[PDB]
Amino acid sequence: APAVTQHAPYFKGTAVVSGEFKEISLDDFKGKYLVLFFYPLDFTFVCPTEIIAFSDKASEFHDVNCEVVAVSVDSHFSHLAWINTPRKNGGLGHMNIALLSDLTKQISRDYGVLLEGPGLALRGLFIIDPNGVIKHLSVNDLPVGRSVEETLRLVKAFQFVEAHGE
Amino acid sequence: PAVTQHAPYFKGTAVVSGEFKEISLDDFKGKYLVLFFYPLDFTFVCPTEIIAFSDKASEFHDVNCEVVAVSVDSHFSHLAWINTPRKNGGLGHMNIALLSDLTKQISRDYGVLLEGPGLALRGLFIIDPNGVIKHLSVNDLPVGRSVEETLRLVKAFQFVEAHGEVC
Amino acid sequence: PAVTQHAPYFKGTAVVSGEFKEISLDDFKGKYLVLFFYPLDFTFVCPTEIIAFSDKASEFHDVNCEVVAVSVDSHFSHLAWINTPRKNGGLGHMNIALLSDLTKQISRDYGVLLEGPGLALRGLFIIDPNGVIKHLSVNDLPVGRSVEETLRLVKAFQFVEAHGEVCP
Amino acid sequence: APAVTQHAPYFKGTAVVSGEFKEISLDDFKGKYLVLFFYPLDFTFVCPTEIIAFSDKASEFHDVNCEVVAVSVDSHFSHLAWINTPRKNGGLGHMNIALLSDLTKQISRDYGVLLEGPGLALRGLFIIDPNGVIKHLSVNDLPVGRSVEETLRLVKAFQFVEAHGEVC
Amino acid sequence: VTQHAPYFKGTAVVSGEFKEISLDDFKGKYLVLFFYPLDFTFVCPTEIIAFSDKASEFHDVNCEVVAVSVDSHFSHLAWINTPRKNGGLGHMNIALLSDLTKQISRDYGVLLEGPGLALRGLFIIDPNGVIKHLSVNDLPVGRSVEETLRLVKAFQFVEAHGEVCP
Amino acid sequence: PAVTQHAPYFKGTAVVSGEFKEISLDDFKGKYLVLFFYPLDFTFVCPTEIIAFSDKASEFHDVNCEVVAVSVDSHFSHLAWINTPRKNGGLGHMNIALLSDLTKQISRDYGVLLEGPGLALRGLFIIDPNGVIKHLSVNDLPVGRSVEETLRLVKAFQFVEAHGEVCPA
Amino acid sequence: PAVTQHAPYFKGTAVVSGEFKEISLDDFKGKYLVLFFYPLDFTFVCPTEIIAFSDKASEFHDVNCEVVAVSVDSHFSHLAWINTPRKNGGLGHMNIALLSDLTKQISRDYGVLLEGPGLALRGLFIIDPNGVIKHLSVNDLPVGRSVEETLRLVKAFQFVEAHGEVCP
Amino acid sequence: PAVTQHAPYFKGTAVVSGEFKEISLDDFKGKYLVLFFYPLDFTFVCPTEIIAFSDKASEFHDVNCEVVAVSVDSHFSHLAWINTPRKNGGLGHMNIALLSDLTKQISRDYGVLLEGPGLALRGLFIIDPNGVIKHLSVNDLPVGRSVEETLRLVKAFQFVEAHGEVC
Amino acid sequence: PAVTQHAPYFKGTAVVSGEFKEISLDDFKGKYLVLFFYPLDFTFVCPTEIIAFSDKASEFHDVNCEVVAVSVDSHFSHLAWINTPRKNGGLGHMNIALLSDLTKQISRDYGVLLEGPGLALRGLFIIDPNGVIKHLSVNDLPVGRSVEETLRLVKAFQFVEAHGEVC
Amino acid sequence: PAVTQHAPYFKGTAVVSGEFKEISLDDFKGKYLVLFFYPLDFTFVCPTEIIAFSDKASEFHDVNCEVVAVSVDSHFSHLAWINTPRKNGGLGHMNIALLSDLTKQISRDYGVLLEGPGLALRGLFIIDPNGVIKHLSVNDLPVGRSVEETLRLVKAFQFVEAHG
Amino acid sequence: APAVTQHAPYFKGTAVVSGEFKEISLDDFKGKYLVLFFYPLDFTFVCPTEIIAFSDKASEFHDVNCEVVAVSVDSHFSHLAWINTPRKNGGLGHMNIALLSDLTKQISRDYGVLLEGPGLALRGLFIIDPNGVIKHLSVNDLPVGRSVEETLRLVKAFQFVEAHGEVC
Amino acid sequence: PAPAVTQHAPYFKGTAVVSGEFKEISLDDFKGKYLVLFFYPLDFTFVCPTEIIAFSDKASEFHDVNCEVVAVSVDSHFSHLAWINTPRKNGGLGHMNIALLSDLTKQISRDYGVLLEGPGLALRGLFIIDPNGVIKHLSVNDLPVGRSVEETLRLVKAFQFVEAHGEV
After folding, report:
1. Pair type for strands H32-37 and H65-71
2. Which Enzyme Commission number(s) are on file for it (chain J)?
């Protein structure tokens, strides 16, 4: 497993970034906070409100030296097609955050959020600091969505403690 | 998976006539089944193989044969790909089943999974009414294969089953 | 301690309404349970998370949810912290149970024990009436979490066990 | 053993090449494409149209830098005798392609096409690239013949891809 | 010797047709079982032909003759259908048994594993499936059919009259 | 830990004069150390052993002896217990160190940890200037112990080192 | 031999009221027992500890407590030492039992034997009426032991075992 | 003792032209050797085989071939059998060597010893000039063994070994 | 074997009165038995001892003692040697049994086999009516052994059995 | 330990002339040695053997032979027993060493330890100037050996190494 | 085992008793004391003083219920030849004690007196009681003669102690 | 284990009675000479000694052909001497012209394989040993029966004869 106070497991994969395919990795985020979250599958009948809320609020994360990356076991071609589906047809539309592909499933496995039975991720969220250390993790059962505002709050509070103690 | 052996059992969610249906190797008993594998939905390779099989499905249906295409994508990707129009790299209406191998086990069982990238080679299997493999072939990821040759194979196997080899 | 698995059994002495009561996971069979861990009694940190949970306890009860707080301190420490008034960094009265983990085994089974120092990370578990873990989260030692977001989640899990579709 | 994207298994054996005995190996094909195909037995009651069709079209393969060799578990003496039986009579007449003998059965075994029970090969075909990597394999039950034109089409199509990738 | 002939089964060419034969078809008779390397070689085929020419002589003393190679039964038939004047066998009075799997030659200790073909081995097997005589040659030397006949007669004589000298 | 054994090395956070300080066995070289374990802070049991040691602390100091009390409680527990006044059940001012054994390893190393409930027996150790255990004592119950007698023992060990064991006769 | 556990069983020959008697741990069932070891009879160390326990033997008797002294000497030596007058380094009259541990197994069982020299450390055990060890101490050296502190210890055990652990 | 392999090495005492002489396999380098085993000297079986070989010995010399008969008897039995006139079941004059295998080790090494009764089967071996076994045969019982046919084999090996397999 | 222990078992084919007979140690229950070994039939040593034993055979029978001569030769050599007239180095007719040790196991079990050359030392055993060894002697290959002394020893054993042995 | 073999090693504290002294087998090289064991100091059995050896000790010294008594008692008991009036069950003055075998290893190594009660049998050993055991004897009960006979044996061994 | 307080090891053998061969065992001596002693060899140039002295005194032993048996590694035939040699001629003459043969040397081995190098017994002596317990043992080197008077004193002393244990 | 014919005689060393006195003799003393080494059960038996006496009388006849005769039993050398000093008319040996070797340890009989382990005495075995220590002849009789000295002598001459001559 990953665990709070421990260096985050290394990851590398193909992501959709600003409608391009780009390889990314844990090392790209050196010196920045990272919010890494998992979701089960592209294109489902579940409302993409969590992914869309992170995309809508990305600028709030960017202004506190924090990046946001979404991950699922779908291919990077699925992610791009999801992105190019209009919001009114189940789609994501424009994304302000990277959608990373975990086609081999190793990333979800390394992050301890893979359901091996069905072969998809639980809804896991990780806040990783500028040194690759995991500060916060949470995991929800497949159906339930979580608060963007609360994640932002946490990221800020980690920063506050860095700079001013407890 | 070898010619003359029973085909490995498979079960999964497929897109069949725009709906999600559980299908399995046993659903095909008494029928010929062309099971073929492709790498991924929505790539920049035009889906001409899948589309050609779909356009010719009724030629298979008239010889007591079903056709099922398989990839490691989920059944949701499958449905979205069907619902994307052809002019946009989609499949549009499909006359064949699109089977999801999300767990990758079906591809593994058929000896077509590339483990590194986590996707399947382009492998094709003709399975007879008792579930025995009569023909397999496997192509490297880029090259498309021939629908009319597949149909000829299927009919050649039926001819032999009814008449024999001697000439 | 993974989501979708049954919570590990626990048993220990808690300070429940100013008495010592032996308490176990079996006591919550048929209810939701927020089980959270904190590092230490009597620190120089604002115990705001613990108080916030006691203040909003009625609201968790109103949705059939119990709240249990837990740390590696003795039950004697918990009592002494409760009897310290809030104006002096104490807890004052508490509407939630404070479970003592003196043997450190409950923090160990919930995967939140730091073995070096011998105290628990700030871990939180939402457990359903079948003892199944629906949600977990862990924060590093200093940062407090949000009670209202916890309640929101308990409600949202309940909504799903009745409709499962927060979307037309 | 043999799978697409892997280097083909090494082989060496005696072949009939232009009515003459020659020792040939996979190494003799470096720099060239190779269609290697197996058939069950010389002199059968099944019209050998597959072998004849390949020999007739050997020129077409030669023109796109591709050699063709047929293999069965028969001895090279059976191969030559069959080549010397006229087509009128169920023979092969002359042959524009190498006829390789797998008398020890080890070639068929290495290519995963030997049936151990009767000791003869299934109708397997392999397309092997100039670096000896397998690009295509197919296997048929003993009775059914494949299409030579479709095999040519495939060879040309793998060539097309090394030259131009694919983006439609 | 003083030992049972290993069991064998296979497809033979017998009077121009395919028959499945086994050691058990030869209970109550003498069997001469000989192996040769390959059909259609350039070695002179005069051993097989002599056995065919003299087959009736062996029948008259209740003895069958079976030639075996590792060729298929199709090869056997094709070799039988090639005129003698062309290096073929022509009409055959004895069974030509196919050892395609090579297991018969292996069981009889005559298989050269490396090239995968039989040496020129001959076995005289009695009515109870006991081996009375064996001989093996290194090379395309041919053996005398008359002398084989003599040995069969001599084994029969001994079993009827003992071996005491007159 | 038996007698003529060196005392097991220990290290930890202690409250010393109302302030947190890291201490260890090394700090006591060239001194006598009285090291004693008690089960828990804040119990209903009489705290008097700790108090008597604190009151008489100067008397141990005058014979080159230091006194350290230990339990499995955190150092925060210990301080809160110190800031709890005596009338109220606390310890008030402490003239001796209160060492925290949060990890439980010190109790375990000194053979006094009860692993079942995870707390220490009431053991006392007199350790000499070379870190050799001259005396050990263990009680299974909130029975007290004379601080006067512990001082007597410490003086006696010094007497015998200086004069030996021969009876005046 | 650990506080909370049952005292190891012992048996052997003691001097009691100038006489040889077999005594064992079972003889003290229902009573308190101070059992204490010393190294040797007739040394040049003052036997003030042994004499002091003897002098206030009846104060132990009055609280249902017996005192047994043990070393690895024979009972013949014990008797001789009892018969040496105190001005000469002897014991004179003894009101406590002097147990002989000639095989050394008693010291070995109580974890007080120094195998190398073959004599006991100065260990003292307070054993309750059920055979449970309530108190133990071991000294490196003849530093004496307060007899009055052992008595106070005995009475405090008796008080707690009746009343519990609370602050009167 | 298998065709195509080197003949096991042997050494022992033989009767040669009426005398005792140590012979070994190396004595035969550069010559063909016919080496044959028989059970016992002095039985009630007609010694037709040994006598026939002896009478045609010079025909084998003419093609550079030597003949050695062997049994598990001592050289003394050999000599005494030689001095027994032919009309009494003796061998009379011998033109071939009679080798003794008293320890039974030659017969073991050649794969012809029956251990239970402690005597050799009727094995015959043709060994070429380099000591390779070209031909072996073994008979149960005191059936014949043609000498003209043994000779013809020796001539045939010589031919092929110089000319090859083709006629 | 050793004086005092039961004689090892033996069984084999003997020449008895010019004919082949299967004999064994059991055939001699109730009789004394003189069992001696010699190296080989038909050697250049005078068969002085064998012949002397045969001349005195009835003297042994008179005292209920049999005599068996043994060697590693076959029973067929024994016969030939018996049917060779004494003046030609043969034995001429024999009044004692000549037992064949062809397998060499009898000499092995009696402790007189030389494994190197494969023949027996000159060993003699006197075996009582219950099969106990009462006397053994072993000699160098060239030696003279006396029948009269052997007969004396047999009688003396018979003496001791009847009358004890107190001076 | 059997006759004709080297005596096992021993080291211990003895009472020699009213003082404690460490003595060992090595101290006796070049000399004969009578080493004998007895059960316990201060028993009710009259100390008859030990007193006799002490009385005749000079007769042993005269022939180059020390005498050492040994039991499993401590050297402090030994002293106390020596400082007890002979008319009180005591030994009074002693002219021979009293060796303490508190660890019982000496009794063990000389094959006279009774492991059950933890004390030695009445064993006696004559050891020669090179450490070789020349004579040994062991009794069961309290029954007494003869000092005259032991003295005789010693003289007899000495005579032998000189005459035969 | 040959150690004091232990049952004496069993022996059987041929003895010379009153001029006749007789087999005797340890069992024959049940209910009686037995002095069992060993010497190296019959017919030595060392005069047989030890043996003769015991024989002279045999009846003083019988008075006290004690048999005496001498043993060495010689055969019973040497014993008898030695007894048949008059004392006036260097021999033993008439013997009033049993002379046991230990030809196999097993008796001497079992009594721990066999010197394995030369293969003869040391001069050992054993007093065995009526139930076969060894009460006394002693061993001298080969040359040195022991005392019959002393051996007799011992036997009486053992009996004395048995009849009335020795206090003072 | 025992020795057999064609083998070198096991070395022996021992004390023998030679010319009425003790001498140490070993196999080495007999190099360059023939040796008759014979075993008998025991001195002083009621079986009067034909075998031994007969060898002594014929002693010179063996000395004449370069051959020594040594008699051996498991008896001590003192028994040997005592037996020699017993006059023949009394069932003794009288003068001996042959060495009488003593095998007290029984090793020599054991090494020559003539030792009966049950009773610990030799069988009546005789060995003829050559100048080079090689056993030419062995012969063993059961305990009661005597061997002929003439035959033994005939044998020695026969062995010598064969060292000089062939076989007509």
Report:
1. parallel
2. 1.11.1.24
User: Which of A39, A74, A105 to mutate to probe the B interface, most B CBs <10 Å?
Assistant: A74
Distance CA C68, CA C96 (A): 6
Q: What SS3 class is residue B148? A: helix
Task: Provide the shortest C-alpha distance from residue E72 to chain D (in Å).
Answer: 8
Please tell me which residue of chain I has the smallest CA distance to H88.
I80
Give the closest-approach CA distance of G46 to chain F in angstroms: 5
| Domain CATH code at residue E93 | 3.40.30.10
Torsion sign, CA atoms G147, G149, G150, G156: positive
Which residues in I lie closer than 8 A to residue L162 (C-beta atoms)? 140, 142-143
Q: How do beta strands J122-127 and K123-128 pair?
A: unpaired
Active-site residue among F6, F24, F43, F46? F46
Structure tokens, A136: 């916060």
- In sequence order, the β-bridge partners of residue D67 are D34
Distance of alpha carbon G140 from alpha carbon G123, whole angstroms: 9
- Contact between residue F1 and residue F111 where contact means Cβ atoms under 8 Å apart: yes
Residue of chain J whose alpha carbon sits nearest to that of G39: J74
Q: Which long-range contacts (CB under 8 A, 24 or more apart) does K7-12 make?
A: K7/K131, K7/K132, K7/K133, K7/K134, K8/K36, K8/K126, K8/K128, K8/K132, K8/K133, K8/K134, K9/K110, K9/K111, K10/K110, K11/K100, K11/K107, K11/K110
Of G60, G37, G33, nearest to G133 by C-alpha is G33
Q: Where are the alpha helices (DSSP H) in chain I?
A: 48-55, 57-62, 75-82, 105-109, 147-163
Contacts (Cβ under 8 Å, ≥6 apart) of A97: A51, A54, A55, A58, A68, A69, A70
Element (H, E) at D143: none
DSSP J93-129: S-SSEEEE-TTSHHHHHTT-EETTTTEE-EEEEEE-T
Whole-number Å distance between alpha carbons of C7 and C34: 11
Task: Check residue K45 and report its DSSP letter.
Answer: S
From chain E, the residues in CB contact with H158 under 8 A are none
Query: How many domains, in total, are found in chain G?
Result: 1
DSSP F80: H
Closest approach of A83 to chain C, Cα-based (Å) = 19
Q: Which two tokens stand for residue A82?
A: 């999801």
* Way it was determined: X-ray
Contact call for K158 and J149, based on CB within 8 A: no
* Residue C35 lies in domain: 1-168
Residue with the two structure tokens 């003592």: C100
Candidate from K4, K139, K166 with C-beta closest to J139: K4
Side chain identity, residue I112: V
- How are beta strands B65-71 and B97-100 bridged, if at all? parallel
> Is chain H in touch with chain I: ≥3 Cβ pairs within 8 A?
yes
Tell me, in Å, the resolution of the deposited structure.
2.4
Q: Are strands I19-24 and I32-37 parallel, antiparallel or unpaired?
A: unpaired
- D-chain residue closest to B156, CA distance: D144
